[PDB]
Write a protein that binds this ligand. Structure first.
Ligand SMILES: CCCCCCCCCCCCCCCCC[C@@H](O)O[C@H](CO[C@H](O)CCCCCCCCCCCCCCC)COP(=O)(O)OCC[N+](C)(C)C
Ligand SMILES: CCCCCCCC/C=C\CCCCCCCC(=O)OC[C@H](COP(=O)(O)OCCN)OC(=O)CCCCCCC/C=C\CCCCCCCC
Ligand SMILES: CCCCCCCC/C=C\CCCCCCCC(=O)OC[C@H](COP(=O)(O)OCCN)OC(=O)CCCCCCC/C=C\CCCCCCCC
Ligand SMILES: CCCCCCCC/C=C\CCCCCCCC(=O)O[C@H](COC(=O)CCCCCCC/C=C/CCCCCCCC)COP(=O)(O)OCCN
Ligand SMILES: CCCCCCCC/C=C\CCCCCCCC(=O)O[C@H](COC(=O)CCCCCCC/C=C/CCCCCCCC)COP(=O)(O)OCCN
Ligand code: SF4
Lengths: 59, 303, 99, 49, 83, 129, 156, 70, 98
């Protein structure tokens, strides 16, 4: 079995064209990326307090 | 007591520039699921001091063959212009009350490219000169649209006086009157200060760095004054100062956020961005903002 | 007088700080051991200059709007902006904005 | 990693690109000949980190 | 008819910046000739006194020239107050 | 009197012209021209021409001498003549310059045509072939 | 006396400033570079110690040799070292940079980066963990804290 | 957590407070407890010069009320 | 006519003479031309402002613009000449003679 990664054909009606134009002119995906980065700032960091804390090890 | 006022304008700007480096590190780290410097000082608060002392006690490297004159001249001009761009700003009272304050700021920003040109020329290498020429081209390209956007916005103000921007926005911000101009202004100030996604390029290095940062903070404060008009009480200016500082901080943090959110352009891509997307729209919106006050009979007072 | 003093103070501080930065590590002893000329860069410089001249013409617009001749002023301002757009269009269509 | 790249351009466009490699040639294939199969297994860990 | 609509459709896609810019510029060109408030702007500009209004020498033949600012004769700015 | 500050500025103007007119190392000539332009704009600003002096400072320095430096890097009795009255509630130079769009329609037309023709001309000259 | 007191205190301040902000340039020659980017990763976060990530050679304080040094690469590493401003330090990471390691008897491998540049800290491993390299960096910080330049200058 | 960023920001905030605030206070100190007079357009400057002349102490901000009309 | 006008005229004369000397480097000829422009701008602005000739406040800017345009043209020509010889030296321009 195989899968196609980039074989979509954009819709050509007025509504889809206007959605794409609004994305182009109003920067929707850029604001979406900003929103993703904003979420990360508010969550707990992964940093441990070396040398007072040590990374996990095994026998 | 004018000298004391000049000093109280100069020194805190440099201190805020020093601590902006720390914020830039902390904010980027926390957006990257880590922390910024938290060891040097109680909260990394002494990290800028350690950086400054380390930078000033390192060996400096002269080219030994380049023009030492322009080599020392460039950082002087950069830092002097960076500090000079602060005198007309009303927060809420300017240090110097200029009639044409906005034009003066535009002129200083235009002068700011001589430092890039002279550093590239005094580098005594072909590759550094190529980089300098690329940076100069980007800077001039984007200051074109900065000027056009700025006068198109000022057409609602009535003059070039920065103090009248407070009066124009007494009831509503200018962001609501013209947001597209604000978006292009924000992106053009990002490209003007060579900040990501437009960053294609010991002692004098620190001097240049301070100037770049001072320019970032000043540009964000100018943006806040232009488009986010704080309400000013003539009997309590501290309220205006607090509002203006908070908005400036928000915009600077947004600059860091953008640096942490996106890849960077190619040189041709940002050149095309300006010349083929911002300039046509900027011209169209300049025509619109020329026509609108006449159309709606809403011409500002001063002449 | 105030602005000259402000410029003198700014330049003086920048000069003092630069010179001390350049001379503090110079007192302690140490080891102490082409052609291309791309035409497109010149073209973009010249294009910026021409658009700068047109912007210079546009600059008196904030004062131009109190004249009692609003129709003539609006016509001439729109004429200059359309002229700017025409320059941009001609440079665009003649492969003048490429890399 | 470590990479040397000799290329000629006509302005912005790349006209010819020539990569120079061997800045990380350790001679693993010849060293393998002096080890047993078990001893030569760990080299393949290092081939692609 | 069909060609123009198809061209506008194919320009709104893959070139929306130019379509928006041309639309805004064309509106800026056309609309001022159609608005009813531009004459009000001209009148407001005419009603701003930048110079001193030099009085006229009375010769007994000026019914429409007031003798005092509070006299009803002369231009009025009630339309400005109501705006 | 500040020892004829206008005369001092004019003398610095002339000295900068002497410096850059010897034509040594065209980059240094450009630096001399930059200093001279700054001094001249200072003269105009002190004379009372705020907008015109700032226009020198912006257009001349920021664009034109900048393009000059770009291209070079690519290669190898005062105070008495003044008036007595005031201007009113406006600046006379700003009103005169703003009269360009109402009075100087012919000037606007010819200048715009010349600028567009300049764009066309520059491309033609540099087209090469 | 005060003459030596002031130099002791000033040397303490200068050492604290130098150590508390270490800007490393990295020679990511081989797989030890992976563990170094892992020491730059969120879990360990070298930047929180004042050690920025990927500084330029002309504004670097310490060089980290992480990987094997081949005979084809040695001149470039020496040149990059020579460009570095002083004071400068070198941290050798992993067996390959320490003494040749798994390729010690090879015709094309430098048997230790200390044949080329003087080394201040040797971090052993193949590869050293991110924690091991962090320990080496903090050990370099202590080594810098130990030094005393103003005292030596005053006593000569 | 993220409020570890707040101290440094706060520090910078205080720095950015110093210029603006300072200006106002100087403008209160050198102008007799009032805002510094704005003098554009050369008519306001004429008013300032007249005030300075009639103040009697060569300072424009010393205002003369109806007590001075005699 | 005070001495400030004398100084501006003298600066124009110095720039004109330097343009006429032509030591080398045609770019220096362009620099002398534009210094001449700057002197003209300063002097005309001084005269117009002094006499309160309001409508003449347009004149300096116009001159500025036009002169700058010519400067652009000059630069272009210089560039083209370089593409023929590699240097903008004056003495390369001797193909045509009297
Ligand atoms: C008549 C011959 C025409 C055919 C020959 C063509 C030759 C070339 C065309 C250029 C000549 C254009 C003539 C316009 C002269 C301008 C002045 C005149 O029109 O009066 C003005 C009227 O203004 C008009 O609106 C002028 C607008 C015309 C310009 C728009 C288009 C121009 C394009 C011409 C060619 C330029 C480049 C080519 C582009 C296609 C003044 O207005 P007003 O307010 O009463 O008076 C002001 C004085 N006050 C203040 C004391 C009261
Ligand atoms: C927000 C705050 C930010 C502050 C910004 C920085 C402010 C500047 C403060 C600088 C603090 C002092 C730094 C001085 C350190 C200089 C470097 C140093 O360690 O000196 C070592 C150097 C090495 O000597 P040798 O043994 O001969 O070496 C031969 C081997 N090649 O010794 C010296 O030269 C010492 C020079 C005498 C200094 C004694 C006087 C004290 C100076 C006070 C501060 C002066 C600067 C202001
Ligand atoms: C560097 C910037 C130099 C000029 C800065 C100020 C220019 C300005 O716009 O204001 C001029 C200022 C305020 O003017 P208005 O806004 O109209 O308000 C007063 C009316 N009530 O008034 C003045 O003219 C005073 C200043 C005139 C004398 C000094 C002029 C500056 C001379 C600079 C010489 C330096 C040349 C060195 C080379 C420079 C190239 C980098
Ligand atoms: C009825 C009368 C009304 C008058 C008309 C009003 C209608 C206006 C509607 C349109 C206005 C939109 C203009 C806003 C700017 C648009 C510019 C633009 O579209 O450029 C983009 C590109 O813009 C960018 O990519 C810039 C992004 C740079 C990276 C940084 C991202 C930052 C975004 C975060 C939000 C910014 C917030 C700004 C507000 C700040 C306020 C101070 C297009 O480029 P491409 O998609 O690649 O293709 C062009 C060729 N077809
Ligand atoms: C009519 C009013 C005039 C005033 C408004 C003008 C304001 C400023 C806008 C003009 C700026 C200059 C524009 C120059 C146009 C050049 C076009 C061009 O060459 O681009 C073509 C393609 O562009 C075109 O197809 C030509 C323009 C397309 C039409 C644009 C819109 C025309 C009018 C549409 C709207 C009409 C009114 C709005 C209707 C809504 C109702 C109000 C190729 O693009 P490349 O990036 O080089 O190649 C891509 C492959 N790598
Ligand atoms: S063998 Fe050891 S030293 Fe060499 S690259 Fe692998 S982990 Fe690093």
């Amino acid at each position: 079995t195989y899968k196609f990664v980039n074989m979509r054909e954009p819709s050509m009606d007025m509504k889809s064209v206007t959605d794409r134009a609004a994305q182009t002119l109003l920067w929707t995906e850029l604001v979406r990326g900003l929103g993703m980065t904003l979420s990360y700032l508010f969550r707990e960091p992964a940093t441990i307090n070396y040398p007072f804390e040590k990374g996990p090890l095994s026998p | 007591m004018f000298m004391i006022n000049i000093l109280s304008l100069i020194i805190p700007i440099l201190l805020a520039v020093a601590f902006l480096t720390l914020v830039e590190r902390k904010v980027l780290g926390y957006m990257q699921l880590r922390k910024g410097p938290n060891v040097v000082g109680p909260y990394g608060l002494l990290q800028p001091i350690a950086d400054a002392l380390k930078l000033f006690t390192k060996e400096p490297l002269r080219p030994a063959t380049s023009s030492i004159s322009m080599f020392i001249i460039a950082p002087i001009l950069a830092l002097s212009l960076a500090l000079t761009m602060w005198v007309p700003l009303p927060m809420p009272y300017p240090l110097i009350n200029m009639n044409l304050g906005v034009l003066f700021m535009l002129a200083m920003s235009s002068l700011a490219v001589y430092s890039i040109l002279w550093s590239g020329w005094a580098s005594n290498s072909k590759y550094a000169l190529i980089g300098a020429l690329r940076a100069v081209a980007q800077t001039i390209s984007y200051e074109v649209t900065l000027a056009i956007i700025l006068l198109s916005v000022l057409l609602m103000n009535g003059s070039y006086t920065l103090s009248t921007l407070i009066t124009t926005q007494e009831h509503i911000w200018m962001i609501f009157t013209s947001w597209p101009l604000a978006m292009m202004w924000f992106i053009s100030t990002l490209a003007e200060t060579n900040r990501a996604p437009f960053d294609l390029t010991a002692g004098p290095f620190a001097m240049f760095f301070m100037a770049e940062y001072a320019n970032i903070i000043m540009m964000n404060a100018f943006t806040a004054i232009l488009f986010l008009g704080a309400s000013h009480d003539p009997h309590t200016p501290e309220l205006y100062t607090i509002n203006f500082v908070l908005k400036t901080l928000a915009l600077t943090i947004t600059f860091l956020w953008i640096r942490a959110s996106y890849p960077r352009f190619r040189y041709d891509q940002l050149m095309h961005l300006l010349w083929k997307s911002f300039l046509p729209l900027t011209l169209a919106l300049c025509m619109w903002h020329i026509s609108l006050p006449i159309m709606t009979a809403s011409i500002p007072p001063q002449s | 007088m105030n602005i000259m003093l402000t410029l003198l103070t700014n330049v003086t501080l920048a000069s003092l700080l630069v010179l001390i930065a350049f001379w503090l590590p110079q007192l302690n002893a140490y080891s102490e051991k082409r052609l291309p000329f791309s035409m497109k860069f010149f073209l973009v410089a010249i294009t910026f200059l021409l658009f700068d001249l047109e912007i210079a013409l546009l600059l008196p617009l904030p004062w131009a709007s109190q004249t009692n001749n609003l129709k003539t002023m609006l016509t001439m301002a729109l004429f200059l902006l359309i002229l700017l757009a025409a320059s941009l269009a001609y440079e665009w269509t003649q492969k003048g904005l490429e890399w | 990693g470590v990479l040397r790249l000799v290329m000629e351009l006509s302005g912005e466009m790349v006209r010819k690109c020539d990569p120079h490699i061997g800045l990380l040639h350790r001679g693993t294939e010849k060293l393998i000949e002096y080890k047993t199969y078990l001893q030569a297994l760990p080299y393949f860990d290092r081939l692609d980190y | 008819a069909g060609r123009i609509a198809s061209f506008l459709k194919n320009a709104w896609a893959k070139e929306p910046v130019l379509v928006a810019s041309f639309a805004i510029g064309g509106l800026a060109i056309i609309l001022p000739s159609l608005s009813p408030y531009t004459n009000y702007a001209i009148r407001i500009n005419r009603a701003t006194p930048y110079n001193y209004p030099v009085p006229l020498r009375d010769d007994g033949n000026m019914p429409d020239v007031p003798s005092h600012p509070q006299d009803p004769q002369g231009p009025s700015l009630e339309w400005l107050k109501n705006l | 009197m500040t020892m004829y500050i206008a005369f001092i500025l004019s003398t610095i103007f002339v000295i900068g012209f002497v410096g850059f007119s010897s034509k040594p190392s065209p980059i240094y000539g450009g630096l001399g021209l930059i200093v001279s332009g700054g001094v001249g704009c200072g003269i105009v600003l002190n004379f009372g021409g705020s907008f015109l002096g700032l226009m020198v400072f912006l257009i001349y320095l920021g664009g034109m001498l900048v393009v000059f430096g770009y291209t070079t890097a690519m290669a190898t009795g005062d105070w008495v003549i003044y008036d007595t009255g005031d201007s009113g509630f406006f600046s006379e130079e700003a009103m005169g310059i703003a009269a360009l769009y109402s009075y100087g329609t012919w000037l606007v037309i010819v200048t715009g045509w010349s600028l567009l023709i300049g764009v066309v001309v520059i491309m033609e000259i540099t087209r090469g072939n | 006396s005060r003459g030596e007191y002031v130099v002791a205190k000033l040397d303490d301040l200068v050492n604290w400033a130098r150590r508390s902000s270490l800007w490393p340039m990295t020679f990511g020659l081989a797989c030890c570079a992976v563990e170094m980017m892992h020491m730059a990763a969120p879990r360990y976060d070298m930047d929180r110690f004042g050690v920025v990530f990927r500084a330029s050679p002309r504004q670097s304080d310490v060089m980290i040799v992480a990987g094997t040094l081949t005979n084809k690469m040695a001149p470039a590493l020496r040149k990059v070292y020579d460009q570095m401003p002083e004071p400068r330090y070198v941290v050798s990471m992993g067996s390959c940079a320490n003494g040749g390691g798994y390729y010690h008897y090879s015709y094309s491998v430098v048997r230790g980066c200390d044949r080329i540049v003087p080394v201040d800290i040797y971090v052993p491993g193949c590869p050293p963990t991110a924690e091991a390299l962090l320990y080496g960096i903090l050990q370099l910080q202590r080594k810098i804290k130990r030094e005393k330049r103003l005292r030596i200058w005053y006593r000569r | 957590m993220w409020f570890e960023i707040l101290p440094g920001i706060a520090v910078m905030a205080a720095c950015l407070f110093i210029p603006g605030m300072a200006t106002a206070h100087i403008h209160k100190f050198t102008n007799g407890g009032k805002e510094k007079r704005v003098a554009h357009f050369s008519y306001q400057w004429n008013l300032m010069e007249r005030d300075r002349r009639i103040s009697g102490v060569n300072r424009y901000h010393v205002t003369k009320g109806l007590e001075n009309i005699d | 006519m005070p001495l400030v006008y004398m100084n501006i005229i003298m600066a124009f004369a110095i720039a004109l003479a330097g343009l006429l000397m032509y030591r080398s480097h045609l770019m220096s000829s362009l620099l002398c031309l534009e210094g001449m422009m700057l002197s003209l701008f300063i002097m005309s602005t001084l005269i117009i402002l002094n006499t309160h000739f309001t409508l003449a406040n347009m004149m300096p800017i116009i001159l500025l613009v036009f002169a700058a345009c010519e400067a652009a043209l000059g630069l272009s020509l210089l560039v083209m000449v370089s593409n023929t010889y590699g240097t903008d030296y004056v003495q390369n321009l001797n193909l045509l003679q009297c």
